[PDB]
């Protein structure tokens, strides 16, 4: 949602 694959 915000980091790497999120």
Three-state helix/strand/coil letters over the chain:
CCCCCC
Q: Which long-range contacts (CB under 8 A, 24 or more apart) does 1-6 make?
A: none
For tokens 């980091």, name the residue: 3
Whole-angstrom Cα Rg for the chain: 4
Site of tokens 């999120």: 6
Name the method of structure determination.
NMR
């Amino acid at each position: 949602r915000r980091w790497w694959r999120f």
